[PDB]
Amino acid sequence: MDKRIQEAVSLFEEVLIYGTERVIRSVDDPLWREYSPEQMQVLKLIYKEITSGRLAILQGVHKSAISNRLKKLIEKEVISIKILVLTALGETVIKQSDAVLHEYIGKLMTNKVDDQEIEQFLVTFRKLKEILKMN
Amino acid sequence: MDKRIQEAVSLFEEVLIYGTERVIRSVDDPLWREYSPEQMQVLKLIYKEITSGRLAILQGVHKSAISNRLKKLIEKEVISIKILVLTALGETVIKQSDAVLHEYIGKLMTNKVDDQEIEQFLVTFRKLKEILKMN
Ligand SMILES: CCCCCCCCCCCCCCCC(=O)O
Ligand SMILES: CCCCCCCCCCCCCCCC(=O)O
């Protein structure tokens, strides 16, 4: 019952929600209208790390809900089921979606965080990823 | 086109996915079986900060998808639509769900991150939240 952990986890969740809103409201690209961030997370999971059940757990979704969500991405021909696999279009989509995101966050963070803070964040987050990621 | 920003944002997204998996796979509480993390995010958004359209943007979901998701939470009587509002049950659920989460993360982080790192994370994340959160 550590107040510091309550606040750390709450802040993490807030940075996700408020960053998500900032990006959706602030970029112009058609892909950031066509594809939700939750859809982009399916594509980036297949790209990097996927069965329907594993996807559900990694996205924090009930297994029962994941079928109907995958249907929309199959209809858009960004994934296929064979495991889930990216199509060439899906790879093209998630690379450009990510480029739009990274360019936008880099321009927002200019003159608000310094190089020292960015470099520290990389070491802190690699460490946190290694703690959390199960074998 | 800053490599450091690409890696920072990618790491943030990975800590979300791998932390989500760690918690779902590692805690015992009935609420962390009944309620998905995505459902818990609707309850915590109403609790803290909600129209259907605002919720969609903050969760990174298409507006078209949010109705059918809210239906399950209405059927469980954790929310009502009147804006979205928490019920007493919804408040009870999200307080216990959060307690389970915070207790678990605090025990996982014991002897893996030090007090200095936790306290630094609070200052860094308050700053990042303030940059991202729109008016
Ligand atoms: C002090 C901060 C330095 C790190 C530089 C920025 C890291 C950004 C991490 C939070 C990003 C939140 C955006 C969520 C949107 C998304 O990933 O789709
Ligand atoms: C060096 C780190 C110190 C901070 C202490 C822990 C902060 C944890 C932040 C990542 C939590 C990820 C868990 C996601 C699950 C969820 O919130 O439902």
Numbering used by the authors:
A (entry chain A), B (entry chain A): 1 to 49, 52 to 84, 93 to 145
Can you quote the paper on this entry?
The structure of PaMarR in complex with palmitic acid has been determined at 1.6 Å resolution. The crystal structure of PaMarR belonged to space group P41212 and contained one molecule in the asymmetric unit. Specifically, the side chains of Val15, Val23, Trp32, Leu111, Ile115, Met119, Val123, Ile128, Phe131, Phe135, Leu138 and Leu142 in chain A, and Ile5, Ala8, Val9 and Phe12 in chain B, form a hydrophobic cavity. The carbon chain moiety of palmitic acid interacts with hydrophobic residues, such as Val15, Val23, Trp32, Leu111, Val123 and Phe131 in chain A and Ile5, Ala8 and Phe12 in chain B [Fig. 2(d)], and the carboxyl acid group of palmitic acid interacts with the side chain of Glu13 located on the α1 helix from the other subunit [Fig. 2(e)]. The palmitic acid molecule was probably derived from the LB medium used during cell culture and protein production; palmitic acid was not supplied in the crystallization step. Accordingly, the B-factor distribution among PaMarR, BsMarR and StMarR was analysed. As shown in Fig. 4(e), the DNA-binding domain of PaMarR exhibits relatively high B-factor values, with a disordered region between the β1 and β2 strands. The conformation observed in the PaMarR structure seems to render the effector-binding site narrower, creating an effector-fitted structure.
Multiple antibiotic-resistance regulator (MarR) family proteins are dimeric transcription factors. Binding of effector molecules to MarR proteins gives rise to conformational changes of the MarR homodimer, which sequentially result in dissociation of the repressor from DNA and induction of gene expression. The draft genome sequence of the psychrophilic bacterium Paenisporosarcina sp. strain TG-14, which was isolated from sediment-laden basal ice (Taylor glacier, McMurdo dry valley) in Antarctica, has previously been reported and a gene encoding a MarR family protein has been discovered in the genome information. The crystal structure of PaMarR exhibits an overall architecture comprising a dimerization domain and a DNA-binding domain containing a winged helix–turn–helix motif, which is commonly observed in MarR family proteins.
